[PDB]
Write an enzyme that holds these catalytic residues in place. Structure first.
Site, short mmCIF file in Angstrom:
data_model
loop_
_atom_site.label_atom_id
_atom_site.label_comp_id
_atom_site.label_asym_id
_atom_site.label_seq_id
_atom_site.Cartn_x
_atom_site.Cartn_y
_atom_site.Cartn_z
N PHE A 209 0.89 -1.16 0.00
CA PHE A 209 0.00 0.00 0.00
C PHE A 209 0.91 1.19 0.00
O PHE A 209 1.86 1.25 0.76
CB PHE A 209 -0.97 -0.01 1.20
CG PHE A 209 -2.14 0.95 1.10
CD1 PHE A 209 -3.25 0.69 0.31
CD2 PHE A 209 -2.16 2.08 1.89
CE1 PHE A 209 -4.32 1.56 0.27
CE2 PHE A 209 -3.19 2.96 1.83
CZ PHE A 209 -4.30 2.70 1.04
N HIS A 212 0.64 7.55 2.10
CA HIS A 212 -0.57 8.30 2.33
C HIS A 212 -0.56 8.88 3.72
O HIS A 212 0.29 8.56 4.58
CB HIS A 212 -1.79 7.37 2.28
CG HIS A 212 -1.77 6.29 3.32
ND1 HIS A 212 -0.93 5.20 3.25
CD2 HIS A 212 -2.47 6.15 4.49
CE1 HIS A 212 -1.10 4.44 4.33
NE2 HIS A 212 -2.00 5.01 5.11
N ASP A 214 -3.39 9.28 6.89
CA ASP A 214 -4.65 8.63 7.28
C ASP A 214 -5.81 9.60 7.29
O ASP A 214 -5.68 10.81 7.59
CB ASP A 214 -4.54 8.06 8.67
CG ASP A 214 -3.82 6.75 8.72
OD1 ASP A 214 -3.38 6.24 7.69
OD2 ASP A 214 -3.58 6.26 9.82
N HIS A 268 3.01 7.63 5.59
CA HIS A 268 3.51 6.33 5.84
C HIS A 268 3.00 5.40 4.77
O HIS A 268 2.16 5.76 3.94
CB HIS A 268 3.07 5.87 7.25
CG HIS A 268 1.61 5.92 7.48
ND1 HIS A 268 0.90 7.06 7.69
CD2 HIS A 268 0.73 4.91 7.46
CE1 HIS A 268 -0.39 6.74 7.81
NE2 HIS A 268 -0.53 5.44 7.66
C1 LIG Z 1 -3.93 1.07 8.90
C2 LIG Z 1 -3.09 0.00 8.20
C3 LIG Z 1 -3.87 -0.56 7.00
N1 LIG Z 1 -4.28 0.50 6.09
C4 LIG Z 1 -5.53 0.94 5.97
O1 LIG Z 1 -6.42 0.42 6.59
C5 LIG Z 1 -5.77 2.01 4.94
C6 LIG Z 1 -4.73 3.13 5.01
S1 LIG Z 1 -4.67 3.97 6.62
N2 LIG Z 1 -7.01 2.69 5.17
C7 LIG Z 1 -8.04 2.70 4.35
O2 LIG Z 1 -7.94 2.26 3.20
C8 LIG Z 1 -9.34 3.28 4.86
C9 LIG Z 1 -10.42 2.23 5.19
C10 LIG Z 1 -11.62 3.08 5.69
C11 LIG Z 1 -12.85 2.25 5.95
N3 LIG Z 1 -13.24 1.44 4.78
C12 LIG Z 1 -13.99 3.12 6.41
O3 LIG Z 1 -14.99 3.15 5.68
O4 LIG Z 1 -13.87 3.70 7.48
C13 LIG Z 1 -3.06 -1.55 6.25
O5 LIG Z 1 -2.41 -2.39 6.88
O6 LIG Z 1 -3.01 -1.58 5.00
FE LIG Z 2 -2.38 4.44 7.18
#
Ligand SMILES: C=C[C@@H](NC(=O)[C@H](CS)NC(=O)CCC[C@H](N)C(=O)O)C(=O)O
Ligand SMILES: [Fe+2]
EC number: 1.21.3.1
Length: 329
Positions: A209, A212, A214, A268
């Site tokens: 990933f 970005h 958060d 990150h």
């Molecule tokens: C936080 C770490 C995790 N990343 C994540 O979860 C990534 C980047 S912070 N975040 C997202 O895509 C947002 C999901 C939001 C969720 N569907 C909602 O509707 O609230 C990973 O391990 O990829």
């Molecule tokens: Fe994140």
């Protein structure tokens, strides 16, 4: 050749109690961490993370392809037009390795006023069949409240850290209306691992990933003990060590907005690792109408040249933008 990021371990247990001086000393640690790399591990948090990881594993490893279509968000199943956020996020063998299950506030029931008004970002959670996943919904809903409690304590510490009264953020973080989400992410072991599911950073690092900020006020994250996260600092991207006993905490871009970038949302990314592991974030979101007036703790009068932004505006804009930037996940 990558250096380790400074990510202190902060005993947050005072934040649950009534020793005001002790809370200030935790707040200082939060301030320091937020001003430095922007990450810390919350320890002495009171949550049974081993059990969380076990219940989550039981779910991920037993759910079937049939159940995943039946629970799928709209991006994977056009029959489910109400499911933008909550439900199953499918893998695509050969192309996309990660898969996940997202749920929202258990209080968003069919009779909740924001569900009746069809307010964006509010949905009623979808759940697998109880007989196929005994106990899972009840465990997951209780987890939501356990991590809500931790997050409320953390928000007390961030408020004190910024020179505010301890309920500055927590007064906008309420069980009846929070937009907070839990995501149960499965990163699989695959042999062979599809190249199409691996991204490559400008510096050559293989990623799952991309970079970005958060979309959150703060993010409260449990991960398995497999190192994977990296934080950009002035000295470049640095590795965040794993700690499957703590919660990894960072600010999201709503905090950076309210603080005039005093507490930055750290940039990150997630390294590609061929290992079966879990990533279980709780995104601390406020209520749809919550507005915190922006301020600046570096300025004598505390004034900021930023405009107030409602959390709901922030959140719907941010989630869509993150999908556009880094892909549907
Ligand atoms: C936080 C770490 C995790 N990343 C994540 O979860 C990534 C980047 S912070 N975040 C997202 O895509 C947002 C999901 C939001 C969720 N569907 C909602 O509707 O609230 C990973 O391990 O990829
Ligand atoms: Fe994140």
């Amino acid at each position: 050749s990558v250096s380790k990021a400074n990510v202190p371990k902060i005993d947050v247990s005072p934040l649950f109690g009534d020793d005001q001086a002790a809370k200030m000393r935790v707040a200082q640690q939060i301030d320091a961490a937020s001003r430095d790399t922007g990450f810390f591990y919350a320890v002495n948090h009171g949550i049974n993370v081993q059990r969380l990881s076990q219940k989550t594993k039981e779910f991920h490893m037993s759910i079937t392809p049939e159940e995943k279509w039946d629970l799928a968000i709209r991006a994977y199943n056009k029959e489910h037009q109400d499911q933008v956020r909550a439900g199953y996020y499918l893998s695509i063998p050969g192309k996309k390795a990660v898969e996940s299950f997202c749920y929202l506030n258990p209080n968003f029931t069919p009779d909740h006023p924001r569900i009746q008004a069809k307010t964006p970002t509010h949905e009623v959670n979808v759940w697998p069949d109880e007989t196929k996943h005994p106990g899972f919904q009840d465990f997951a809903e209780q987890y939501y409240w356990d991590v809500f409690g931790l997050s409320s304590a953390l928000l007390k510490g961030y408020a004190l850290a910024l020179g505010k009264e301890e309920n500055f953020f927590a007064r906008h973080f309420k069980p009846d209306d929070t937009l907070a989400s839990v995501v149960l992410i499965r990163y699989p072991y695959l042999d062979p691992y599809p190249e199409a599911a691996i991204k490559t950073a400008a510096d050559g690092t293989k990623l799952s990933f991309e970079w970005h900020e958060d979309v959150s006020l703060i993010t409260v994250l449990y991960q398995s003990n497999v190192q994977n996260l990296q934080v950009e600092t002035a000295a470049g991207y640095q590795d965040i060590e794993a700690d499957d006993t703590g919660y990894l905490i960072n600010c999201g871009s709503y905090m950076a907005h309210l603080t005039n970038n005093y507490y930055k949302a750290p940039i990150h990314r997630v390294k590609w690792v061929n290992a079966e592991r879990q990533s279980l974030p709780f995104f601390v979101n406020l209520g749809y109408d919550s507005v915190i007036d922006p301020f600046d703790p570096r300025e004598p009068n505390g004034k900021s040249d930023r405009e107030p932004l409602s959390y709901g505006d922030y959140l719907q804009n941010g989630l869509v933008s993150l999908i556009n930037k880094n892909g549907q996940t």
